[PDB]
């Protein structure tokens, strides 16, 4: 009979980065609000 | 234990994911 002692399995398990890892990020335009002051479209009319 | 860095060429590391909205 021979023993597993020098010859034993080996298990593995990866470093996994994710602890320093980036975040995703979302964006949003920040738009120019008609609640603030914003212009308008000049539909104009004529008086005759 | 001991470090070993895998030889996974580059061509195999891509990913595809389908998913619902839940």
């Not at chain 1, 597993?4 to 593995?12: E, F, N, R, V």
């Not at chain 1, 320093?20 to 479209?41: F, N, T």
């Not at chain 2, 070993?4 to 389908?18: A, D, G």
């Amino acid at each position: 009979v021979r023993e597993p002692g020098s010859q034993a399995c080996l298990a593995i398990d990866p470093l996994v980065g994710e602890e320093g890892g980036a975040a995703v990020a979302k964006l949003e335009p920040h738009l120019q609000p008609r609640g603030q002051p914003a212009p308008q479209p000049l539909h104009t009319l004529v008086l005759a | 234990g001991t470090l070993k860095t895998s030889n996974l060429p580059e061509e195999l590391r891509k990913v595809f994911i389908t998913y619902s909205m839940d």
